[PDB]
Swiss-Prot record, chain A:
It comes from Saccharomyces cerevisiae (strain ATCC 204508 / S288c). It is found in: Cytoplasm. Component of the large ribosomal subunit (LSU). Mature yeast ribosomes consist of a small (40S) and a large (60S) subunit. The 40S small subunit contains 1 molecule of ribosomal RNA (18S rRNA) and 33 different proteins (encoded by 57 genes). The large 60S subunit contains 3 rRNA molecules (25S, 5.8S and 5S rRNA) and 46 different proteins (encoded by 81 genes). GO terms for molecular function: RNA binding; structural constituent of ribosome. Component of the ribosome, a large ribonucleoprotein complex responsible for the synthesis of proteins in the cell. The small ribosomal subunit (SSU) binds messenger RNAs (mRNAs) and translates the encoded message by selecting cognate aminoacyl-transfer RNA (tRNA) molecules. The large subunit (LSU) contains the ribosomal catalytic site termed the peptidyl transferase center (PTC), which catalyzes the formation of peptide bonds, thereby polymerizing the amino acids delivered by tRNAs into a polypeptide chain. There are 2 genes for uL24 in yeast. It comes from the Eukaryota. This is Large ribosomal subunit protein uL24A. Keywords: Cytoplasm, Ribonucleoprotein, Ribosomal protein. GO terms for cellular component: cytosol; cytosolic large ribosomal subunit. One of its GO terms (biological process) is cytoplasmic translation. The gene is RPL26A. The chain holds residues 14 to 120 of 127 of the full protein.
UniProtKB/Swiss-Prot annotation, chain B:
This is Large ribosomal subunit protein eL39. The lineage of its organism: Eukaryota, Fungi, Dikarya, Ascomycota, Saccharomycotina. It is found in: Cytoplasm. GO terms for biological process: cytoplasmic translation. Keywords: Cytoplasm, Ribonucleoprotein, Ribosomal protein. Component of the large ribosomal subunit (LSU). Mature yeast ribosomes consist of a small (40S) and a large (60S) subunit. The 40S small subunit contains 1 molecule of ribosomal RNA (18S rRNA) and 33 different proteins (encoded by 57 genes). The large 60S subunit contains 3 rRNA molecules (25S, 5.8S and 5S rRNA) and 46 different proteins (encoded by 81 genes). eL39 interacts with YIH1. HAMAP family: Ribosomal_eL39 (MF_00629). Component of the ribosome, a large ribonucleoprotein complex responsible for the synthesis of proteins in the cell. The small ribosomal subunit (SSU) binds messenger RNAs (mRNAs) and translates the encoded message by selecting cognate aminoacyl-transfer RNA (tRNA) molecules. The large subunit (LSU) contains the ribosomal catalytic site termed the peptidyl transferase center (PTC), which catalyzes the formation of peptide bonds, thereby polymerizing the amino acids delivered by tRNAs into a polypeptide chain. One of its GO terms (molecular function) is structural constituent of ribosome. Its main location: cytoplasm. Residues 1-20 are annotated as: Disordered.
Curated annotation (Swiss-Prot), chain C:
It is found in: Cytoplasm. GO terms for molecular function: RNA binding; rRNA binding; structural constituent of ribosome; zinc ion binding. Keywords: Cytoplasm, Metal-binding, Ribonucleoprotein, Ribosomal protein, RNA-binding, rRNA-binding, Zinc, Zinc-finger. One of its GO terms (biological process) is cytoplasmic translation. This is Large ribosomal subunit protein eL37A. The chain holds residues 2 to 73 of 88 of the full protein.
From Swiss-Prot, chain D:
There are 2 genes for uL29 in yeast. Component of the large ribosomal subunit (LSU). Mature yeast ribosomes consist of a small (40S) and a large (60S) subunit. The 40S small subunit contains 1 molecule of ribosomal RNA (18S rRNA) and 33 different proteins (encoded by 57 genes). The large 60S subunit contains 3 rRNA molecules (25S, 5.8S and 5S rRNA) and 46 different proteins (encoded by 81 genes). uL29 is associated with the polypeptide exit tunnel. The chain holds residues 1 to 68 of 120 of the full protein. It comes from Saccharomyces cerevisiae (strain ATCC 204508 / S288c) (Baker's yeast). This is Large ribosomal subunit protein uL29A. It is found in: Cytoplasm. Its main location: cytoplasm. The keyword Nucleotidyltransferase does not apply. Belongs to the universal ribosomal protein uL29 family. One of its GO terms (molecular function) is structural constituent of ribosome. The gene is RPL35A. Keywords: Cytoplasm, Phosphoprotein, Ribonucleoprotein, Ribosomal protein. The lineage of its organism: Eukaryota, Fungi, Dikarya, Ascomycota, Saccharomycotina. GO terms for biological process: cytoplasmic translation; maturation of LSU-rRNA from tricistronic rRNA transcript (SSU-rRNA, 5.8S rRNA, LSU-rRNA). GO terms for cellular component: cytosol; cytosolic large ribosomal subunit; preribosome, large subunit precursor.
Amino acid sequence: KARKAYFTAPSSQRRVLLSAPLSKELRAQYGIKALPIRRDDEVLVVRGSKKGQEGKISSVYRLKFAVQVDKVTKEKVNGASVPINLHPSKLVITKLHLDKDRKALIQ
Amino acid sequence: AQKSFRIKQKMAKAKKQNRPLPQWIRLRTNNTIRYNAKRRNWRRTKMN
Amino acid sequence: GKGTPSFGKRHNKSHTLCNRCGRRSFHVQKKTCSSCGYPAAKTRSYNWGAKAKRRHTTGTGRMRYLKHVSRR
Amino acid sequence: MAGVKAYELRTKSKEQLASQLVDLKKELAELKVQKLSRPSLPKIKTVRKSIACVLTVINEQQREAVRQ
Amino acid sequence: SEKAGHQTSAESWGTGRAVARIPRVGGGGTGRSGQGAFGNMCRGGRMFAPTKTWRKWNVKVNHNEKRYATASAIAATAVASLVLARGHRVEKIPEIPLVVSTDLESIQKTKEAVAALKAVGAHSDLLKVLKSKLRAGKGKYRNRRWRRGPLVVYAEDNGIVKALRNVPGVETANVASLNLLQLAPGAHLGRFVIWTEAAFTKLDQVWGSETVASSKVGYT
RNA sequence: AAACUUUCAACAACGGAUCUCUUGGUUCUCGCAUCGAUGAAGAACGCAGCGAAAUGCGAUACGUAAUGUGAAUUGCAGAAUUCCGUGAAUCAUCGAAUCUUUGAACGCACAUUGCGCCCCUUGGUAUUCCAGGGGGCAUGCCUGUUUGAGCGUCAUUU
RNA sequence: CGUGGAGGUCAGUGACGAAGCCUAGACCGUAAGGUCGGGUCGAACGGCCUCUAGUGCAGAUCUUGGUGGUAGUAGCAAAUAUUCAAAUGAGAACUUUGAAGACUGAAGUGGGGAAAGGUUCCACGUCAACAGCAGUUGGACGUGGGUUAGUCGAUCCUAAGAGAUGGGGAAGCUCCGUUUCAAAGGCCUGAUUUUAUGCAGGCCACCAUCGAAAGGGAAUCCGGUUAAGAUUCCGGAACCUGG
RNA sequence: GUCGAAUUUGGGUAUAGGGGCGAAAGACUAAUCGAACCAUCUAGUAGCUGGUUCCUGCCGAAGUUUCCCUCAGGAUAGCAG
RNA sequence: AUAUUGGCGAGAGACCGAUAGCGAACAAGUACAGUGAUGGAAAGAUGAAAAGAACUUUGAAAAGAGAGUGAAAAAGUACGUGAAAUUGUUGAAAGGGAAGGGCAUUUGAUCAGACAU
RNA sequence: UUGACCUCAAAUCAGGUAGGAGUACCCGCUGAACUUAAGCAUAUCAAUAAGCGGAGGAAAAGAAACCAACCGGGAUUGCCUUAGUAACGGCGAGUGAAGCGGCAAAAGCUCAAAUUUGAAAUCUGGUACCUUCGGUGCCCGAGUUGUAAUUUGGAGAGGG
């Protein structure tokens, strides 16, 4: 159909598309379905082959549609290191870099 | 051919964009398409 | 003669561009033509698919939903 | 200004916002006299957009003026 | 598209150059449109027909007929030597039609419904709606990516038991409606009516402004 | 007997068909009332630290302001130095701005960036000559204002 | 018999591999066709009952794209015109240098220009392409540089001519008229003046303006300079214009 | 052939389509001329040419009648399904 | 007052699916052609992800051979699929001016069934 | 010598005004041929294309100088009908619209012509709920002034 307002929308609503589920612990304590994947947050790559593997979502390349996890990185057999683009809503929000703003948002 | 700015400026531009593909753009994380593709050759197509 | 041998004589013009549009088109000696016939220009058209489309400069009348409908 | 904006918004004279502007300008200029390798610019860009912040904040607080 | 590729200012060439008497255009740059267009045989020329809005898009059938019609196959909803073969999967009690307490004109809840429509014995079918393999032909590419057999259709009287909305396959109506499509869709004779209140008991209620009739004696 | 030649095998090879793909197109239907002398449509010429173009923008030049969003990065993560809890290039924004040289084009022109006239203010320092920044001089009509025109014509102390 | 698509139903087929493609491999139809196997690839697809139409190719000197026989063939033949040796290079018939031999032999193959060309100019780098053999070479490709005015020229003048306005024709875009139709057009010296502005008087449709890089036409020359400019830059020596 | 005169030629200007210009040929008028070029009317018209796409099964021909500005068309009978 | 349709806005379709579909899925009214008015195209798809390939071979060098990346390089920015014309190679077979059918068979090659337990 | 009345101007002197654009669709003007007639003029094509000048959210039309038999009906607009019929026509080829009927949407109204010659109008100033060139006031000042109010289908009465 449309699906281009999709594959062609502005960050102002690309974060909220690049979203992610909350940790059982978190999804119980804090008590929210999920949220707008946030940076200084931590997570645990749920069902992707780099499974269970864990760490912090350094940056999120929205203009690439996909967020990246610090430690979890793709290794070159060529003495070099390169990030491994991870798809937000397939990880799981371990802990949130909760800020008065993101805080408030919890409604 | 002692020109006039009208044809000067223009002459000058022929120059300014007479240049091979940028090479940065070549790897803009999106696509980019290769080759100047608009390429005057002061011996092929011609000015005014 | 009529051809080759002639032909290689092209060395005057029908151009000098314009000042509006400018696709080479002012009959130097005649003055003004091929589009915005300076003067009265009026584009000077007819009925045969041109374009003549391009980019403004308006469309900022996405105001409307904000004319004096958000100007005050 | 270089901010803010929320800053330049107040409030020194036209002959005060003055050498602020003239300042940033002699900046941008020398900032160019650099011109040597890289080039980043980066704060040539900074100094620039700012140059304007000043300029714009400068052409309003003389307008609301005329508006009296 | 009316401007249908009779969009060129092209010509013929007066037999005299081997080429054929088709319109051609250009020059120059390049090959085409110095080619040969404004024609069916060529590339990007008129369709033959070239279709149009003006066609006979909609069709007209008569009342007394769409009546012997809707009727013909209200009465398919019983004799279910067919209603077996026409889709829906039954054991369904020794009771065709097969009515339900006039409760279900409320049931403001899905499961309480669904499930109810199920101990009502529909499970067997309320599941068939769930061998849903996804289309085939390029249909897909154009907003129709489904292919799910038909289902169970419950007849109203008061509301839409619209709990039964997201119900995967089953479709609700009222009493004086029912498209002679629905009442035997698959446009084949036979569909499941989990009925209802004055429903079965007060379908007819015929007239209307007249109707019904038929003649071949002992259908034996 | 080979070479050659045809033929059919498999492998490559020329070529880009068939299959599936769709941020197009095409036709439907349903809301909605807006350009410009308050300078439009269109055109040039330019503007990124790095850019050719498509795109956006105008010497405040891929943008100023202002909002809410934002809450966290943009030109999103090309690289790159890049910079961030006092709000970053994204959306919306048109209750603000900037809007070169133009075009209904406009003081005269305009195959040129050519040629005048006012007013204000700076240097030469006598306003009247030469250079700098600011503001300005089209036409047709509408209406009033304000001066003067005829033996159109009235009346007055001569 | 076969096709795109639509309603249905077969709880049909399928990443353990759906289409499509490849088979002097197998079997069914008298045949349209159909079904396996095997190889092959990658995400879709079919049987049956019906519905629908842009539903079947060998041609139409048919459209468009692609190929081949012709065939390594035709062809690459305008000035006597070329040679030795170094050097630089992975490689010299062809690049540079040296020497030799010969031309164009001042109505040139030399030294500037026009008009047109836009950077071909210059330096540096380097050969996929292009050059029609070749290439180290180029006008080629890549990155950078270079166009310096009171005296040169354009700018002003008028030429045929083009053309707004006083107006007049035309439904109208517009046509027609610069020599036969208020207020004129302004300017000028003196002027009512302490710096506005009448006035004394004069010339008065000046019938706008555009139109020459060969016509008309203020005023520069010598020497030096560069990778590439120059009657300019710079040295000295000048003349014109306005104040 | 002619080669100082009806010379040759640059630039500028003027004449544009049944209109130009022409020491006249139907010449020239951007390789275009016994009426330029561009677009549109416009898929112009076509009693004439060309092609007109998958199987088998059945039945199975006309050229002759009459009226037409019909002579290559058509009507009309007659043949067929 | 369905009284009339392609600029804003938004729904949708037994519509086309890249020689179809607007000419334009793409830096398309572009490249490019014509003094001029006008005329005006070809052109989509490695993957899930660049993970876009760091000895040795001349390298003029370009690449090659191994290597390595991947679910696969029978995915190499000449990138899914890769028919055909058509070309190479291997393999067989046949040829006294020519092409290739049709009926029967010889020979060779190859295949199914019938398995009778 | 000094005021006006009046036609005429000139003002950068005040303030607005237009001029261009533009897919569709609306008001006009102006106008082909190709075409069919198996010829070709009539005519058809067609009040069509092209050309030109004007709008809008629609536009245009609209309170009848109508339709009509009696019967009567009652502004436009649109639709379904009327109707491929009345007519028009080398009465050939072809043209071919109306008006009591059912729908859709519903609205009706103001001038000129009549008196007490205007106490009605523009401005620009001061001030004013409205914060600077500005929605409207008031008072006042110049200017306008054959253009202040009842009356216009039906008459309201118009006057008494």
